[PDB]
Ligand binder design. Structure first.
Ligand SMILES: CCCCCCCCCCCC/C=C\[C@@H](O)[C@H](CO)NC(=O)CCCCCCCCCCC
Ligand SMILES: CCCCCCCCCCCC/C=C\[C@@H](O)[C@H](CO)NC(=O)CCCCCCCCCCC
Ligand SMILES: CCCCCCCCCCCC/C=C\[C@@H](O)[C@H](CO)NC(=O)CCCCCCCCCCC
Ligand SMILES: CCCCCCCCCCCC/C=C\[C@@H](O)[C@H](CO)NC(=O)CCCCCCCCCCC
Ligand SMILES: CCCCCCCCCCCC/C=C\[C@@H](O)[C@H](CO)NC(=O)CCCCCCCCCCC
Ligand SMILES: CCCCCCCCCCCC/C=C\[C@@H](O)[C@H](CO)NC(=O)CCCCCCCCCCC
Lengths: 264, 264, 264, 264, 264, 264
């Protein structure tokens, strides 16, 4: 049966936190390989040339981000297998960000001209790069709490987070609320449009990020539902910490709702 | 029963030819939207900074290409169901090059510095666009027969052709010949390595090309083997003309080989 | 029945210590047979001539060795039949190092020009050669604790140790952990590549060392699994102290894990 | 049933001739990588330093080789299944000489000072390098007809040929003639000893050549006797052109003698 | 049944002691027939002309004899039927040294020039010949405890002792320790080579000594195992006191080993 | 059955003739290794120091050899299986003389003082030692037909021939003529006495020759009678051409006598 394991969720949380820290450190390291990165003219793209620069394009995208988390944690509160939900979400997020780190290290591609005014630069020594990494870690990347002061690289994390939250929200509700699913979909597409129209990422970057998160999420859910982690030695699943997480769960997780407060 | 439909192979070949012409025409549109494409500084990668440029590394990849195509024709000659193989191959290449057209249209990504001496430019009119289109089409894009005079763009097709031919060669030979398979894999790896070391394309270009070819090839083979084109309305398959092309053949194609010449 | 005998492991450890001391003394003696060994021009190799010397490339090999040793210690801690594993590892390493001594005494093949600054030399007598042997013995031969001051000779031991530890880690873990196996393989390959690129040994030395360790390991384990130590007079096994160590063990050793500590 | 295939032996002979030509060309090109190779002090060996040079010690090896060749020809003449023997000998020697090419291209190990009077050198171009290759090929490499004028490199071929012919003579005679076997063993040992005492190869070269020939011969014959070419996909035998040559032969080859001449 | 007779071993040991005394007597008497025996030129051999004399090659033989003797008493201690072994060994040595006495008495063959500085000579009388005889007897004939001051004679006894101890070690230690047998054979071969190369004995003397020891040992073992002392009057065996010695023992001696100490 | 083979005795004759020629050539070449050989004083032996040299001591021994072969051919003429005797006699004489050649090559031991007047010496060339070999071959070594002009070496052939003839004569007659056996025995001992008193050989040489011929003859006859040449792989008889000669003969050879003349 489905036994709720309370000592594995914290392991997933620390794992995803270490993944975020490694991503921030790799970002800091890679931001050094090019000193200026703000003098070249932009590469010819289809979308960013038609629409002129709209200064406030970031605000609503990220605010839609917290709307998505808000609905996500409300669905979390009243659903009985919350532990499995928090066990799957971090386990997927860490792997996606590890792929982002690998793509980051292989190739760097930014937007040539945005945040040409961020100051600092050339921190050559061991002591203070850790300070930048800790800042962008405990700043969580929003532009409201100013950490994202200069440019951004290939494989934007905003798109991945938005799509992952939308999919997790839409998949763990009963299949009769087809109005919240539509709202989440239009909300995610609005966020995608706005970040693309912010002139900070190229169309190919957002497209491959969206495709990668969708494919990884669907593949993980199909593998979990099929229950092939122990059926046979089918394909030697390469997902980081997959069998150690879903071995205690057999079959598909139901969608029963309850209330963990004994004070009606 | 396997009925060789000889009136559908011509349609597939015509479709592939118009696809190639369309690809040439789209490239014709693409390489005029920014004038210079040669004054920019190269983007920082890991494999374009360590290994210096080699000026004979761009023809060994193609030599491997002709080797692989000759091997594929040799395999095609001695096969009972030649029409089905020639049908599937063209159907795959059409979709792959449509994807190439799309990804080149959305964004243009080049190598800033190679083939800077190529002449022409400022070709603004309607009449002679078809001229370079026909030249690139009936020059087949090799660097030996000089057509590839200026630089190349996103989603290189050389790796696409090499990977498709390699996988087709390894697929339709009896499963005891994995010494030719080793040779084909070595040829594909050498072609990829020389493409990368010729300073013709970025690393992510080659990686996404290889991954998309492998994924499309394996997915199409699984779909064809599972005879899901008419079993049920599973996903409304998105392949250009798939049900039209594979409806007359049921089950998995065997590995019976014969000799079409009746003169021993 | 598997009987863990604690009075044979001490014998195996003593045997390995004696073999290591003999190897150190033989190396000390061999270092005298050539006066300079540091003025000749290096022989033309295909790896030593393409990649210039990397000054820091030798410590990474010992780092990989330390990581593999830590993993092997962890495996030995959590195994039911630890004594048999410890008896087998020593019984293999002793034979391999005896072969190293023989092939070092047959011919001396050094690298002419590395560690050319090392002092000492011409310590001709019986009284202080043993001092150098004792230093090399109780310095463990690593360059971190500086004992390896002059060059090294044929049949390098670093590759032997790395390959033996990697094979023992790979084989004595459950056959479902196929990411630890890949990590160990990557570590071993990187160690071999670094020892080759540090201008420390010729390519043939590393290749023959790897082949000899692999063949000896596979042959010994096949003989142990086939119980050919008592089945018949097949070949009069030439492994030093083989039948004595495996007479009490029948069949193959299972993979049961436990915790020797009785305080949960 | 043993079917003597008369159309495969020609293929084996052609394969051996091609391999020999390739080996000669690779030796010719390898000889250029070091300018002098005749001024360095020799490496300290234990056999090259005890026994001074004997000027006439090299022709005895070729005399023993000719005696063994005559005995093997006599055995081949009076055997029922001559074709299989001729098809096996070539298929083994080709692989061994390919291994020789690989291990002598990887590293070069010559004797610095013997045949120091040989003239020629620096024939740099493509037109007359093939002339040197042709001379070495159609001189058979024997010193009686002077072609082997300068030094030789690692993995000597004289020991390979002697050991292969000795093993073929020993194994393919009735198991009651144990004085011919002793004579062949004595001839092979004397040939190896004269090779070592003629100051032509280091001890490790001869030892590894002998071991490699013995191991390859025993492995090939064990695989042929156990009939593993069609039993299952055990290990995918790496012998070049192995399954093709032994497909029609089942079991083991008997030892019935006859006389092909029909005029008693 | 094997009944250990402890009243017959003493007789055999006493007989051996009188045999040794008579051997010293015969050597002393024979030494007086030729006054000088040191001015002759050496007889031409094949092995006394190539290798020059080595001054330390005479003590290594006795070191090998001592270690073989120690191994022999180690085997003697742990044997159930120790008395039978001690009876047979002494019975063999008595006959061998009687034949040695005979072959010195008929003819004298010496090495002309070694130990030419030994003093004494011309000791013609009865009284003090007993003194030198007793010195040779209770000096046991080693060169370390200096008794062997002058030259030696035909049919060297060093090879006799080495071969007898070697064959006794290999026969009466169970038939599967086929590593100790190799060590004993190597020791015997090294002893023979050193006594030959020490310019102490002619080659024919060593060869006939080895042959006679091997023949007598094997013949006695076959005679004892076949139990021909009472089967019939076959040939009236000529061995000194053979039927009186092995009358009790019936059949082949088994190889049961025990521990005579009752204090674990 | 016992079939007379007439095409094998000629092989025996040619084999023994080649052995005789090889012995003569070896004697000729070995005679060169000492120039003078006639200045040393005789070694101390018991028998040649007592009785003075008899100048006419050689003749009667050799004419008694003539008597021996006379009675041998008389027995040959009137016995039915003469072919088997002519096969065995030469097959044994060849092996004995090969042993004589080996022992002559290893060590040379002569009589220093007899035949001081033979002239010639120092034939340093290639041409004329063959003349001496041919002379001593087609002079058959008698002292009557003067060829044997100087001294002889160890392993005298006269003793071997006399003993072999005596044994062959005494074994192939019915066991009821115990007066001719006594005549042959006293005749043989007379020949031995006379040749050893001719101051022509040492006692040890004659004793060794007699023992070797007796042992070889008895061993060959026991092997032939036991019929172990095909019973099993007992000891792999080392006799030169043993199984080839005695495979057509089964059991013991009888002693039926007849007359091959049809003219009574
Ligand atoms: C429930 C999941 C919460 C995840 C929140 C993401 C925080 C990542 C910060 C780690 C530092 C790495 C630096 C940069 C990258 O992360 C990229 C680069 O722009 N920035 C980002 O992705 C920032 C994503 C902002 C939109 C998230 C909306 C969901 C809000 C949940 C808040 C509790
Ligand atoms: C059998 C199929 C052959 C197709 C080969 C290329 C045809 C593409 C024509 C369409 C117009 C676009 C032109 C060029 C682009 O495609 C890209 C841009 O760099 N260049 C290319 O692809 C050129 C790839 C050459 C390597 C192929 C080696 C295999 C040899 C087989 C020859 C029969
Ligand atoms: C777990 C097994 C530990 C074995 C360590 C052996 C230490 C030296 C003993 C042999 C004496 C002869 C001296 C030197 C030669 O052996 C060669 C010369 O290059 N140096 C060596 O091999 C030294 C091996 C270095 C790599 C080991 C990495 C694994 C780390 C485990 C250590 C706890
Ligand atoms: C029956 C087998 C015949 C094989 C003869 C091979 C002749 C050379 C062909 C290979 C081309 C490369 C050239 C040289 C190298 O190979 C090495 C260099 O040291 N020379 C060799 O190996 C030549 C081996 C000589 C000893 C053979 C004795 C057996 C007598 C048969 C003679 C016809
Ligand atoms: C266990 C029995 C050991 C006996 C060995 C010889 C004892 C003396 C024999 C009788 C007196 C004649 C004296 C000498 C002659 O025999 C010859 C002439 O050179 N010298 C010898 O033999 C001396 C042979 C020494 C080497 C043997 C090594 C074994 C060590 C065992 C010691 C307990
Ligand atoms: C039927 C057997 C015939 C044997 C005849 C042997 C003649 C040559 C022997 C071998 C060639 C080497 C030459 C000489 C040495 O051997 C020694 C030198 O001292 N001379 C010998 O031994 C010759 C021994 C003569 C005494 C025997 C007499 C009977 C002869 C019968 C012949 C019809």
């Amino acid at each position: 049966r489905l036994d709720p394991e309370y000592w594995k969720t914290i392991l997933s949380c620390i794992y995803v936190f270490i993944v975020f820290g490694f991503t921030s450190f790799i970002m800091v390291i890679v931001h050094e390989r090019v000193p200026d990165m703000q003098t070249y003219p932009p590469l010819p793209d289809i979308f960013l040339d038609s629409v002129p620069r709209i200064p406030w394009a970031f605000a609503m995208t990220e605010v839609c981000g917290m709307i998505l988390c808000y609905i996500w944690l409300l669905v979390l509160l009243l659903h009985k297998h919350r532990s499995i939900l928090l066990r799957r979400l971090c386990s997927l997020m860490g792997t996606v960000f590890l792929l982002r780190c690998f793509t980051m290290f292989v190739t760097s591609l930014s937007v040539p001209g945005q945040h040409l005014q961020c100051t600092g630069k050339i921190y050559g020594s061991v002591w203070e790069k850790l300070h930048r990494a800790f800042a962008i870690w405990s700043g969580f990347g929003m532009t409201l709490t100013g950490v994202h002061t200069c440019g951004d690289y290939m494989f934007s994390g905003h798109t991945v987070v938005l799509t992952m939250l939308n999919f997790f929200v839409t998949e763990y509700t009963p299949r009769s609320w087809n109005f919240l699913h539509t709202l989440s979909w239009v909300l995610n597409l609005f966020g995608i449009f706005f970040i693309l129209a912010a002139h900070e990422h190229y169309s190919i970057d957002v497209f491959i990020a969206f495709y990668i998160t969708t494919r990884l999420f669907l593949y993980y859910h199909t593998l979990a539902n099929t229950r092939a982690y122990q059926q046979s030695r089918r394909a030697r699943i390469w997902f980081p910490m997959f069998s150690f997480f879903e071995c205690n769960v057999n079959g598909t997780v139901p969608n029963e709702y309850c209330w963990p407060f004994s004070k009606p």
